[PDB]
Write a protein that binds this ligand. Structure first.
Ligand code: ZN
Ligand code: ZN
Ligand code: ZN
Ligand code: ZN
Ligand code: ZN
Lengths: 182, 368, 506, 316, 20
């Protein structure tokens, strides 16, 4: 319903939108900090402070649900058209080694942040009870506050042309041609 | 000087054609050959038929997959190569015709054999007008070019020569050649091109090179309608400074015909003498020479200009009358060995060119 | 000397919207975000036109890679692809990180091609047809030669022939015939020879047609500024244009009395302009005979009085100042325009005359097969008849009306190689000059101003007071809105200076 | 003997007839030879290397090759598929959309709630809040990510392009009228040379081109700022008299705050006005995107102190 | 801006006293 995403995270999301759809860049996968790492750090850092058994167990339930939902829906609604080529290459390389793909162990911290932006639009097309909609929204808001606190160690400003440790990589003319032409 | 001059010409190069409405035709070379044979320049030159190149020779620059695609693509089976066509840019601009692989092999073999003859010392001037395709860059076909034979020839020259200079006088920037040697400091590229909303899109005044090849690429952006005097006043000081502060061991010169007046796609206002003055002046330095023919889409103008440049390379100046070649009717009104500059307006100004030259000289200060 | 510096910079920039950005840059540096190089570069772009403030700035703050805009950098994983032939040296000198891809450098917007007139398109179409014929004929001829060699060898370079046979045989039988050939050659050879004969006949006839088409279009193609010169001259030869030019020069000068400077290096072009003017006046059916004689006499008298050329030599072929209004200035500008164009034509007289007279003809096929005297049958080919005088005679023909504009333009194009396109509107410029002279003589204010001009000029020996009273006397007849021109003339070298006093005399 | 050979040429003719008499009337008025080369071509092989259902994709909404379903009129791209299908590795079988197969195979409208509650109880042990969403995602077709229309609209200077790309406020013979204001009639004075240099119709060579920057409307000469041509297709040209908005400090990156709609745009003024360690987000006269008010008179002090400090540390 | 002049004079005198 009413999700209060902080202004800085909104700016980060619009910056990612610009970087992918305009500058023709993709994510440097596998990410240095995947969804699993940041979610586990959040759970370890926060749940140790809570004392209520319900408040401490529902945090773990929410984290597991977020991991499962990310795994289910990243390949369905979390990728632009340009990034589908990276997904296809990852799938091919994974099937080469008989390993099933685990997106929560590959993508990180910027596809999760774009996962919780359509959650108000995702819940609306369900039969969810209003007493749990508020719980989901409040848990997401708490997670967003924690993420905003730790914002300089998951979204850094680094240039692909000056550092190979940047979060974004340029796409070759062949890559862009295959992705957006075929 | 009266240098020994090699001359490479495969008689089959003119039998390959692009689309019907395409502005690029290899047939021009054929007509150029006529103007060279009927002027009696064969008694002054040694004519060789260079061995066509092989896949592994083209793979010194291009990827194996690109060459594998080139050697099997055919207008009969293009529907079986859809991902390859969009990946390698072998669609509408650079199309697929009957003899694509054979034409590319002929051009590459000519360029590499000319470089080899320069290496061994059999000559000090090599001429291959089937080459000059300077737009393809290692994995894709750009600007009607599929194989960068200039890169192969320069690679061959680097084996025996420490440094190589590459000079481009086509209206389009030498994107493929500059990209191929944008990091090394052993192949210095210098391109005089029309920069604006023009096809290359690249080649600005601040594209001097990256890494060890910093300040080893020279871009001269010019406005439309430049004439012989202005082009000379830009070309001569820049090339002299390059030869002074860089000292190449060999020179390669792409004599594109787009700079000529009346070109289909070009916008420059150079005459036949204004375009052969560059070749003559650069030849006047005394270092080993390779000359290749790139752009040019008005067949008669480029054919006559190429014949004039070959004559100049053979230290003789040709007469204006035509010797009754086979393709006589092409030469229109008075059948003279001349190309008329138009009265179009020239936009380049002394202040702009002074600024560009000052920038280029400041960049070139760190090459000696 | 620092708060004064800030005041001086604020005054010099002279715009709040730019001073705000200057302050934004200064603050951006002040918060340890900008380095010295970019700060000095921006201050050079702002105050660098000055040499006092910027130099003190550089000597006061103790000032004492370069990545290109078109080159990206690729990841290392997107670099190593199999390149079989690439040796160690071929590995060290090649670059695999940076790519250009002109789509990126065009901002995904594309490119703008050149604009070509329809005559160039006609030439391109002719060339396309010629190339089609020659390509097909030569390919078929080469295949014929190869089959002839094989046939000669059978009495007891891998796709050209296949393409030729496929083009010749269109019933989808061509593959069968090629396969039969690979394992029946004479029939293919004779069919190819018959096709060659047909194609060469068609090529001969179409070559005739192409030649006669190219003859009437080739020279118009190089006439870039000549094709648009009529409309451009009609638009750009108005009074407002000349006023704008002189006012712009005045404005540029004031931001630091000789706004315009014309030099007259000849004295016989005046006679040619007179001949053209009297030809038009005699021909025009828009003035009565007394008016025609008045115009002729006024023109001759005015030029004789101005340039001090002669009074009788014109009829048989000290520093002065004229205070003028708009009409006189525009009339003088028309005169100077015509004189400049004619002088430009006259300067290259010897070179063009030598080129036309020493015009070689090729004996191999021109004089033997194809003779083209289209422009020579009409006598407009400049044989003898020194090109300046021939051009004058043709201009007289055009003004009279017995020479069409098309053939006049074609003659000028052929005789001058499209270097005499400014004579395309000689008749209209002369007509405008005559109209302006008539307006100069039919208006009371201009008539009285030129009467004062005649009196002062014929005085020829005056004190310093004249420049005042003359102006005042002229200002007695000018209004409080129109503009004033001070046409200074030095007869000693025939040089005319023009100054623009719009309203700076009140 | 084949008769279909004469199809067409560029001449619009079967390449066998002739001048096309209409074209005749349109386009009329009323040192030895080359057969010697083959015996003089010495083959050179001394190379050193000689010894070697609709027109739009239902996921991304763009144009391209499509793989449509026979039962659902919704065409899909190949990369716009989960998982992507390589065109060479065709499935060669009955292909349906995710929604199409869901509605054609498991279409139990009167008993779907049983499957929903079965999934709910299967996920109830560990994750009950996300169970409904986990069940629901399988009922939807693959889609392309899009910002949900409220992340976009919090920044007013951001818009969506045609295919969904990101656009900003930087998306965009002798001519004497380009030097006229065209609004007031005054000549456009170039910032650097302080001249218009209109030239003249007699001598167009004396004219210099002028540009009139898009952002601040200051006119510039194409020869004053070194620039080959104008700007007509790319982004809006920006004069060199603007703030960088992107600085690479020596590496580190600095950016200017994006513009925020005025409803949420908070403002604040410091009470110190002597020295403030703040970013380049100022205004000349949720607490993360504030716009400080720098109080111009302060800058004159501020800058000075810094350079004076730089004058002392470098002195020693 | 007179107080600015006073500040500049006093601060500069202090700097020169520092470098006595
Ligand atoms: Zn070119
Ligand atoms: Zn799609
Ligand atoms: Zn379906
Ligand atoms: Zn300027
Ligand atoms: Zn601006």
């Amino acid at each position: 319903i009413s999700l209060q995403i902080p202004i800085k995270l909104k700016s980060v999301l619009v910056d990612d939108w610009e970087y992918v759809t305009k500058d023709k860049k993709i994510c440097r996968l596998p990410a240095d900090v995947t969804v699993e790492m940041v979610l586990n750090k959040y759970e370890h850092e926060v749940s140790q402070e809570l004392e209520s058994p319900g408040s401490q167990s529902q945090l773990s339930e929410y984290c597991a649900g977020l991991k499962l939902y990310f795994d289910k829906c990243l390949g369905n609604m979390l990728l632009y058209r340009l990034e589908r080529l990276q997904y296809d290459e990852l799938l091919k390389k994974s099937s080469k080694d008989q390993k099933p793909l685990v997106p929560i162990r590959i993508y990180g911290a910027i596809h999760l942040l774009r996962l919780i932006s359509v959650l108000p639009e995702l819940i609306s097309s369900t039969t969810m009870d209003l007493q749990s909609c508020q719980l989901l929204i409040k848990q997401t808001e708490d997670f967003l506050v924690w993420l905003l606190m730790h914002v300089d160690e998951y979204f850094n400003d680094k240039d692909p042309n000056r550092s190979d440790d940047a979060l974004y990589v340029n796409t070759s003319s062949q890559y862009e041609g295959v992705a957006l032409g075929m | 000087d009266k240098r020994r001059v090699a001359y490479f010409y495969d008689a089959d190069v003119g039998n390959y054609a692009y689309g019907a409405g395409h502005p690029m035709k290899p047939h021009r070379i054929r007509m150029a050959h006529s103007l060279i044979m009927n002027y009696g320049l064969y008694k002054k030159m040694e004519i060789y038929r260079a061995k066509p190149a092989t896949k592994q020779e083209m793979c010194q620059f291009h990827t194996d997959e690109y060459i594998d695609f080139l050697s099997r693509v055919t207008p009969d089976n293009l529907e079986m190569f859809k991902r390859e066509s969009v990946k390698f840019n072998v669609g509408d601009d650079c199309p697929v015709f009957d003899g694509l692989y054979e034409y590319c092999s002929i051009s590459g073999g000519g360029s590499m054999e000319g470089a080899a003859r320069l290496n061994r010392g059999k000559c000090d001037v090599a001429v291959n007008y089937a080459g000059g395709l300077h737009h393809a860059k290692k994995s894709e076909a750009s600007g009607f070019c599929y194989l960068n034979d200039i890169v192969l020839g320069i690679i061959e020259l680097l084996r025996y020569h420490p440094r190589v200079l590459y000079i481009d006088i086509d209206v389009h920037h030498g994107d493929g050649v500059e990209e191929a040697f944008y990091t090394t400091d052993r192949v210095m590229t210098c391109s005089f091109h029309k920069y604006g909303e023009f096809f290359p899109g690249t080649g600005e005044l601040r594209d001097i090179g990256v890494g060890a090849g910093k300040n080893y690429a020279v871009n001269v952006p010019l406005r439309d309608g430049i004439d012989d005097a202005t082009y000379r006043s830009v070309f001569e000081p820049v090339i002299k400074k390059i030869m002074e502060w860089y000292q190449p061991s060999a020179v390669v010169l792409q004599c594109g015909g787009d700079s000529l007046s009346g070109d289909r796609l070009g916008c420059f206002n150079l005459s036949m003498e204004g375009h052969a003055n560059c070749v003559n002046y650069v030849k006047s330095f005394g270092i080993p020479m390779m000359v290749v023919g790139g752009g040019g889409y008005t067949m008669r103008n480029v054919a006559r200009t190429w014949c004039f440049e070959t004559g100049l390379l053979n230290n003789v100046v040709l007469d204006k009358d035509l010797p009754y070649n086979e393709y006589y009717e092409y030469y229109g009104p008075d059948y003279k060995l001349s190309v008329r500059p138009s009265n179009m307006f020239n936009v380049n100004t002394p202040e702009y060119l002074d600024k560009v030259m000052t920038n280029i000289f400041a960049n070139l200060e760190n090459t000696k | 000397e620092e708060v004064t510096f800030f005041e001086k910079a604020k005054r010099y920039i002279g715009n709040k919207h730019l001073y705000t950005e200057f302050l934004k840059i200064l603050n951006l540096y002040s918060q340890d975000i900008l380095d010295l190089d970019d700060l000095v570069e921006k201050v050079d772009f702002y105050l660098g036109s000055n040499k006092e403030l910027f130099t003190w700035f550089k000597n006061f703050v103790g000032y004492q890679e370069a990545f290109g805009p078109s080159y990206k950098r690729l990841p290392k994983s997107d670099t190593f692809m199999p390149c079989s032939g690439r040796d160690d040296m071929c590995w060290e000198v090649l670059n695999d990180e940076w790519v250009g891809h002109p789509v990126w450098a065009s901002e995904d917007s594309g490119f703008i091609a050149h604009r070509k007139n329809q005559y160039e398109e006609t030439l391109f179409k002719i060339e396309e047809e010629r190339h089609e014929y020659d390509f097909y004929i030569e390919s078929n001829l080469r295949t014929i030669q190869c089959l002839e060699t094989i046939v000669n060898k059978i009495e007891n370079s891998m796709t050209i022939y296949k393409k030729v046979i496929r083009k010749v045989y269109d019933k989808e039988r061509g593959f069968e015939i090629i396969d039969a050939l690979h394992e029946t050659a004479p029939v293919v050879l004779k069919r190819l020879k018959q096709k060659d004969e047909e194609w060469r006949r068609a090529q001969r006839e179409w070559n005739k047609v192409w030649r006669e088409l190219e003859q009437k279009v080739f020279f118009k193609s190089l006439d870039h500024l000549g094709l648009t010169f009529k409309q451009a001259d009609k638009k750009l030869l108005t009074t407002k244009q000349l006023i704008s030019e002189i006012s712009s020069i005045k404005v540029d000068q004031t931001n630091k009395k000789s706004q315009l400077d014309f030099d007259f290096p000849d004295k016989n072009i005046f006679y040619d302009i007179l001949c053209l003017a009297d030809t038009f006046i005699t021909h025009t059916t828009a003035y009565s005979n007394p008016d025609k004689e008045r115009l002729k006499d006024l023109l001759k008298y005015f030029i004789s009085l101005f340039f001090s050329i002669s009074f009788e030599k014109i009829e048989e072929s000290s520093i002065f100042n004229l205070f003028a209004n708009t009409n006189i200035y525009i009339f003088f500008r028309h005169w100077t325009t015509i004189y400049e164009r004619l002088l430009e034509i006259k300067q290259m007289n010897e070179r063009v005359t030598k080129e036309i007279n020493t015009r070689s003809t090729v004996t191999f096929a021109k004089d033997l097969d194809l003779l083209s005297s289209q422009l020579s049958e009409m006598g407009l080919d400049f044989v003898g008849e020194d090109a300046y005088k021939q051009v004058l005679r043709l201009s007289r023909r055009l003004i009279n009306g017995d020479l069409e504009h098309q053939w006049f333009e074609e003659s000028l194009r052929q005789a001058y190689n499209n270097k005499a396109f400014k004579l395309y509107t000689i008749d209209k410029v002369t007509q405008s000059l005559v109209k302006h002279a008539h307006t100069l003589m039919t208006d009371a204010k201009t008539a009285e101003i030129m009467a004062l001009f005649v009196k002062d000029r014929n005085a020829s020996t005056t004190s310093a007071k004249d420049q005042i009273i003359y102006r005042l006397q002229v200002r007695s007849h000018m209004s409080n809105t129109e503009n004033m021109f001070r046409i200074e003339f030095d007869k000693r070298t025939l040089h005319v200076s023009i100054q623009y006093i719009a309203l700076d005399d009140l | 003997t084949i008769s279909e050979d004469s199809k067409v040429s560029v001449t619009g003719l079967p390449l066998n007839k002739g001048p096309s008499e209409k074209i005749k009337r349109e386009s009329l008025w009323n040192d030895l030879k080359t057969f010697l080369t083959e015996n003089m071509t010495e083959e050179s092989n001394i190379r050193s290397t000689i010894g070697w259902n609709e027109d739009f994709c239902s996921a991304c909404n763009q144009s391209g090759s499509f793989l449509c379903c026979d039962t659902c009129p919704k065409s899909f791209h190949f990369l716009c598929l989960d998982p992507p299908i390589d065109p060479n590795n065709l499935p060669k079988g009955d292909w349906h959309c995710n929604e199409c197969k869901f509605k054609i195979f498991i279409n139990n409208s009167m008993a779907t709630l049983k499957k929903i509650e079965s999934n709910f109880i299967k996920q109830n042990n560990n994750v009950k809040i996300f169970a409904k969403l986990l069940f629901n995602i399988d009922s939807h077709n693959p889609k392309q990510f899009q910002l949900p229309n409220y992340i976009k609209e919090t920044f007013p200077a951001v818009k969506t392009g045609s295919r969904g790309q990101y656009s900003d406020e930087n998306d965009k013979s002798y001519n004497p009228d380009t030097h006229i204001d065209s609004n007031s009639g005054k000549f456009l004075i170039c910032y650097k040379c302080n001249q218009t240099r209109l030239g003249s119709w007699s001598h167009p060579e004396n004219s210099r081109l002028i540009m009139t920057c898009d952002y601040c409307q200051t006119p510039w000469h194409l020869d004053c700022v070194p620039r080959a041509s104008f700007k007509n297709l790319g982004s809006k040209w920006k004069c060199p008299l603007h703030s960088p908005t992107k600085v690479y400090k020596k590496y580190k990156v600095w950016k200017k705050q994006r513009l925020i709609n005025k409803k949420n745009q908070l403002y604040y003024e410091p009470l110190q006005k002597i020295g403030y360690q703040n970013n380049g987000n100022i205004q000349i006269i949720n607490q993360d995107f504030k716009i400080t008010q720098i109080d111009e008179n302060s800058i004159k002090y501020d800058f000075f102190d810094k350079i004076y400090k730089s004058k002392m540390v470098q002195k020693r």
